[model samples]
Target: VDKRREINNEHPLLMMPLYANGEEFNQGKYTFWGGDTLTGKWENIPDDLKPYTVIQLHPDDLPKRDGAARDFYEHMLEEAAKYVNPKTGKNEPIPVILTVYTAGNMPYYTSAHWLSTSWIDKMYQKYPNLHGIFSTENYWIWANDIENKAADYLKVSAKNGGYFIWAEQNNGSAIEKAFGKNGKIAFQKSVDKYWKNLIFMFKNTPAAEGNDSTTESYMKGLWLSNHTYQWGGLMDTWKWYETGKWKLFASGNIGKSQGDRQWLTEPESMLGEEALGVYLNGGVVYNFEHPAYTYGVNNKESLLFSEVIKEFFRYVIAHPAPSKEKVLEDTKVFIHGDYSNKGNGKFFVNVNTDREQTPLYMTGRYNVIPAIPGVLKTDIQIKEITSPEFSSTQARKEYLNKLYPMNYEGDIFAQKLDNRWFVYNYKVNENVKQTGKLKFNSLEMNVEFEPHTYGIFERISNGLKVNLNNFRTNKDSLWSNAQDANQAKKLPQLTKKGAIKWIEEHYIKDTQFGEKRVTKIVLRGIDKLPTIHSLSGTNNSYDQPSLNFDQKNHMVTITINSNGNLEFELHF
Candidate 1:
C-alpha cells in the first residue's frame, strides 16, 4: 500500500525543479553585468543562497551544426560551473534544464536534433553536472510524430543512462483542442500511451490517497500514475481563479471545503480524485505568483514577483517531510497581489489585514527543518505587502529614465577639471574680443576671438571644452558663413566658459563615469527631459544600437549600420 513502491524508489517528496523562464530571468535581454562572466550578478550571491539541485539555462540561440553545438555546450558548462557558492566554497553540481524554442521559423529543428544526440553525449563526457534537455513542439512535427519521436528519444536516453527528457505540448489551446472530445483525441492518446511507458521506465513512486478532505489525495492519485501532464501553458482554471468566477464550475466548492488547501483545490476537484492518477507522468503546476502567469499583458512587475516566488521556494525547501511528531508546521504565507491598475503591478504581502479576516489564517512561520539538522531555515513573515500600480506608461518612463540622464546646464566657461577639459556655452556681444588660456602638464589651449552672431568654442587639453559667442555680423552674410566666422571669433570665450564650468562640475565635487561616484551639476528642466528609448532592432540589424561617447579621447562612434539600419546612439 505504500506509495513509495510505485515510484522509482528515489527520495520521497521529489523536489520539483523550479526554473525562472530564461527570457524572463534575463529580463528579456542579455547584458554583461554582475561579473565579466555571462552569468549576471551570480557572483554576488552568498553560497547558501544558490540553487541546490537544478538551474535553468535558456539560451537565445541554439547552435546549428554539431561542431558549433559541441562548443556551445562546453562554454555553457564552463560558465555555469564558475558560479560556485562562496559560502560553501564548493561547486554545487546542479543540472541545467535547457529550454528550446521551436515555435518560429528558427533553426530549432536542426538544433534540437543535434542537441538531442550530440550535445548530450558531449555534455555528459565533459561536465559531470550535466543533467537533461527539454523542448516544446513546433508546427514542423505532427502530434503523432512528436509523440513517437519523444518516446523513442526517451527510450534511447534511458538505455544510455542519460538524463530525463521532457517535451511540453505546444500550448494550452492546442492540447484542449486536440483532446477536448471535439477533435479526434489522437494526439492525447498518443502522448498518454508513450508517457505511461516512460513512467514505467523511470519507476517513479506511486502516490497514496490521504484521509484528509483536501486536494492532497487527488494530487497523490495523479502522482501514482504514468500519464503526461501539462505545465505552464494558459489554462481555464487560472482565468477562473483570477476573475473570482469559480462558481461557474460546479466543483469550485472544493476550494472553500478543503481545510488547508490554497490554489490546488479547484483544479484537483475538477480533474477528479483519479485525475492526478490519469496523468501521473507530469503535469502543469500553476505558479499563481509568477508575473507572466498572473499579470497577462503586463509583465514588467515580474522583478518583484520573482522575489515573492523566491520566498515561497525558500519556505518550501526549509520545511521537511511531514513527520509523526509534527503534522503541520506553523508557516507564514505571503501572497503579493497586483491590485494597482487592476492587476498591473505586483501584489505585495498585505500584512495589514487581520488573519481572521482572510479565508486562510495565514500568519508568519519560521525555523523549518527538512529532515536534518544544520540546514539553514528559510524565514517567512506576514509583513508589509505592497501592490504597485500597473502602468505600462509608468514602467516605460522609469525604464527610459534609467537609460538616459538629463544633461547639465551652466554659464559658459573654459577650464580643466578632473584632468579633463570641457566647453561651456555663453552669450557674447559681436564687438567684444575675448581670450582664454589653459596650461597644465603638456595640456594647453589658447584662443583669440571676435564675435559675429552666436557660436561654440573648442578647448583642447587632456580633456574637452566648449566655447560660444554672439555675432553682429553683416546682415547679408549667409547663415553658414556667419556661423563659421563667429565660431572662429568666439573660440576664446567658448574656451573660457568650458574651463570654468568643468572646474565647478568636477573639481568642486567627486564624479566618475558609469561608476558609483557622484557629483553635482546645475541641471535645468531635468523633469522635462525626454525619456531614453528602449533598444530594439530587426533581424537584419544589430539587436541594439551601440553607444560610444568619450570626452577624453575626443572620439564618438555609433555603430548602427551593423545590419544597415538607421539607429541612434547619443551621449551628452
Candidate 2:
C-alpha cells in the first residue's frame, strides 16, 4: 500500500474520564500513582505518567437538568480545542462518545433516549463544533424497540454528523443466551457480515477482500473479535469493579485470566502485560481502571477518560494529509515608485530579477535603472538578448544611447536625474479675463531666465502651463524628437528672455500626467547669494536663507524640510 494513503497521519488516542465535580482534572494522578514528587509543584507530574491518565466529571456535575448543561458542554468543547497541535494552529471541533449503562430491570431505553436526544440536539444547535458521537449500552435492553428509538435518534442527528453504536453486555455469551447458539461462533459470523457492510458503507471499500486497498481483513477481524469485546469488557469490568462487586486478586495476571479474575487476583499482577500493551497503544483502551480495582480510588481521573478520547479524535482528524503549498513564482518582482507620495501616486512594475542565474523568457527587454539625478547609469549584463534583425542606425543609436547604453565591460545602462533640489519659476506674461482654449501640439515647455532660474511646466488640457515653482522628477520619462529641421519648425518653439524661457504652444498631455499629480514646479539657476538682516528693535528677525547653486559641478544646495511636514508655496 502507498504510505501516504495507508498511514494514519493523525493517529487518534482516547483519553477517558473527561470531567468530575464540574471541574477539569489531569490524568497524571493514576499513571504516576505513588511516583516520586520530583517537583514540589502539584501540577508538575512526571511526563511518562501524564500521557496515559486523564480527568473527567460525572454528568450530574453538569448543571442538573437545565439549559445550563449546554453551557457546560460548550465549555468542554472550548477546553478540548486547546490541546491541539500549536504548530499546525488548526481549530479542531470537539467530539463526544457518551456511554450509558443501566442496572438490572431498569431498562436503559427511557434514560438513554432522553439524554441522547437532548444532548444531540443541544450539541448540534448550541455547539457548532461537535464532530461526532458514540453511544454504548447493554445488549439485553438493546432490543428491537430500544434499537429503533436509538436508530431514529441517529437519523435525526446524522445530518449533524451522527453516532457510532457500540453494544456493551452483548459479548459471545450474552449472544448465546439471547439467540440460543454457540454465541462466539454465531456472533462472529453475523457480526463479521454486519461489519463487512458497515465498513464498506463508511470506508467506501469492500470488506474481507484480499486486496490491500480493499480492507485490512486481519486488523478488521482483530477489531471485531478482540478489540470490540475488550472495549466492552473493559467498560463493564471497570464499572463492576468501581461498584465494589469485583476485586483485584493479582495485578499482572488480571488481563490474561478468564472471567471474574478481577476478584480472584491482584489486577496489577494479573493484567500487567495487557495493561502495558494498552498503555503503549494509547488509544481507546487505557481508560479501564475502576474503583473496585482500587478500594477507594477517588481522585477524578476516571471521570475525564471520555474527554481525552474526544480530544484524541479531534487531533487525529486535524493533522491528516499532505502539507499545503507555499511560494508560487520565483522570478516575479514588484517595484513601488511613489514611496514619498500618498494615495495612488505609487507605480508598480514586475521584473525578472534572475539575470545572473538563468535567462528568463520575457516579452520585451528591460533594464534595472536607478531613479535619482534624473539619469539612468547602471548596466547589469544580460543573460540573453534576442532580436530577429538587429539595426544600427541614427534613431536606434539615439534610442540606445538615451535609454539602453552599453559599456566596454559588456554591460547595458541608463541614468536617472535627481530633481530633489531642482526648482522651476514661472510668471504669467499677460492676464486673460475670459475663457478661451489654448491648443498645443508637440512642443517643449521651457522656462527662460538666466542661470539658476529655470521654470518647469505642468501640462494642461490644451497647452503646457506653469503656475508653481516646486516639482519632483518622475521616475519614468518619455521623449520624442522631430525627423528633421522642417518638422522641428512645424512644432512649437521655446523663446528665451532675460529671466524667463517661454514655449509658444507646448503639448498638454505629455507634460502633465505622471505617477503622481504635479505638486510644485520650480525655477532653477537663480543667484547663489545669501541675505542676512537683523531687526532694529529688541524683537529680532532675520532675512530669508539662501542656498548656493554650483554651476561648475551642476549641483545645487536647496533647503529642504526633511521633517516630512513642510509644504512649499509656488512662486510663479
Candidate 3:
C-alpha cells in the first residue's frame, strides 16, 4: 500500500470542531493537514434543523456565546459530513468528535489554558469514544494509551497546543497590547513570559491531573501549530515519530496542502520542520502546503514527495517504534536513530546555515537500533538521494515532469532490505546534487558531507516493543528491547512471558552451517514462561541471530557473532 493511504484512506480522523469563540479556529468545516473537512460544535441541545444532535453539551461557561459558536460548528459539521458522504447529499448525523468539558471556571480572557486543557483531556477520558482532542487547539489524533502518564508514555504539546486561545483573548490591557498585533512575534514586551509559559507547561504532570476515574491525558502533547514559521507563541518541543508519536496536524497551512484549502500560500517556506518533522516525529500531515510536501529530486505539492523524502518516510514506517534524537555535529549536526542511543538505522542529516555552503567531515558515534543477537548487517551505504529544496517553481508542469520522473511506486520500495538504508547528498543549489560516503565502526560512523546537503539514514528498526513498561525502558525503544527478547515482540500476547538479561558475551561458532555464534543469558527474571525467543531485525535478521536455548546451571546461553550487529531476545 502507498504511504499516502495513511491519510487518503481516512482512518477515522473524525471532525472535532470547537465552541470557543476565538481567532485560532473558524466557525465550521475545518480541514486540517490532509484529510476530510471535520466540522463540529459544542451545543447544549441537539440541532432542531437536523433530526439528530452531532454532539450534546451543557452549561460550559465559555468566554462568550449567543449560540453562534455552535451554530457555525453544526453548520460546518453538517457541511463537512456532506463532504464526507457527498453521495447522500443530506444531513446525516455523523458522531463528530462529541467533546464535552466543564465550565473550567475560565473567564472571557483565560490565562489558564490548563484550566480548559485539563478539562479537555478528562472529557476524552470520561467519554470512551469521544474524539474530543481537536475541540481544543491541540490537533493530533493520538490514542493516548500510555500506562503511567507522568513518567511513562508522557507526551505533551507546547502551551497545551497553542496559547492563542488565551493569549489572543487577553490582548487588550497594557500587558496584552504588549504582545502586539503581529502575533508572529507577540513576545516583544516580555519574551521571558513566553518562556515561563513554556517552562510551566512542560513541567506540568498530566498523571497528577487524573480524575477520581479513568485513563489520563498525554504526557507529550504540545503546540501543534498550523503555522510553521509563526509557531513561537507556544514555543516548545513535541515528541512526534522514534521521534514519531503524534497522530496528525495542520502543518504548512491550508493552501499549502493538497487535499483542499480555503486560503492562499504565503512565505516561500523555510525550515525542514514542514513534512520531515511530521514523518520523523510520527505526525499525520494536514497537508503539504510547505515545500517538504511537494517538489523533488529533479522538480515540486500537489503531497508530491520526492523519492528521497518518500524513502525517508518509508524508513520510519518500517520502523514505526520511536527512535532517539542525537547531536551529530555533536551540537549543530543533527541525527536520528531507529534504535535507542543510535545503535543501528542511524540517519545523519546535514543542514548548512552559511549562505554559500559549508562542508564538513562528520565523525560521531553511530548509535541506532541494533541488529537482534545474531546477523552481521553493517554495510552503511551512503547514497545521495537529495530532493529539491526551494527549487524553481516557474513552468512547474514541465519542470516537475523533467525532474520528478518517478511517480510514487508503492511501499514495496521502502520494504526492500538493501534499500532500507541510504542518505541524501548535499546540494549546492536546489537544482544541483552532491554525493558522499560512509564508514562504520562499533560505536561511531564516519560521514563525508557535501555542500548544503541534508540526509536521512534510510534504514530503521521494523518491530514494536509490547509497551515500554518503565521510565528506563522508555528511554531507548531499541535498548529496552535489547534488555529482553520478548520486548522486541510486536504483540505482547504473541510473546509468552520470559525474562533474560543481556550478558553481552557471545560465543561464535564455525560448523557444518556457514557460521553460528552463541551468547550467554541468565534466566534472571524468567521465574515463569520457560519459552523464550531470540529475535533479530533487518533483511538478514532471520538467520544471523538464529539460536537454540542451551540451559546449563540455570544459565541460558546461545549467541551470534560479536562483530556482527547484535540484538537479543529474552522470550523463553
lDDT of 1 by residue, 50-107 (tens): 4432343433334444444444445566877665555688875444545432332145
Stretches > 4 Å off in candidate 3: 1-66, 74-129, 132-274, 277-315, 324-422, 425-432, 440-572
Tens-digit lDDT string for candidate 3 (65-151): 444334434444454344333455655434443322122223342322233335444433433323222212111111121011211
By summed lDDT, which 10 consecutive residues of candidate 3 come out lowest?
A: 211-220
Give the CA lDDT, 0 to 100, for residue 503 in model 2. 10
Off by over 4 Å in 2: 1-12, 19-75, 78-96, 100-113, 116-122, 125-129, 140-144, 153-158, 162-167, 171-266, 272-286, 291-572
Q: Decide which is better by lDDT, 2 or 3.
A: 2
Across residues 1-572, which tens digit of lDDT does each residue of candidate 2 receive?
01101112233223243332322212212121211111111123223334322332223233233443344444555554344433466663333434332221132222222344656666556554343344333443434333334343444344454332333332212222222232223333333233211110001011111111111111222332222211211322232222222121111211212222222122121122122122112113323333222211222221112122222233224423111111001111111111112111111112211121111111112222111100111112211111211122233234334444331110111111111111211111111111111112332111222111112233334322331111111211111243432432333322211001101111111222112121211223323322222212101111122344456543333332110001222221
Instruction: Score candidate 3 by lDDT.
Output: 0.22
**What is residue 351's positional error in candidate 2, in angstroms?**
79
> Residue 101 lDDT in model 2?
23
The 0-to-1 C-alpha lDDT of every candidate, in the order given, reads: 0.28, 0.25, 0.22
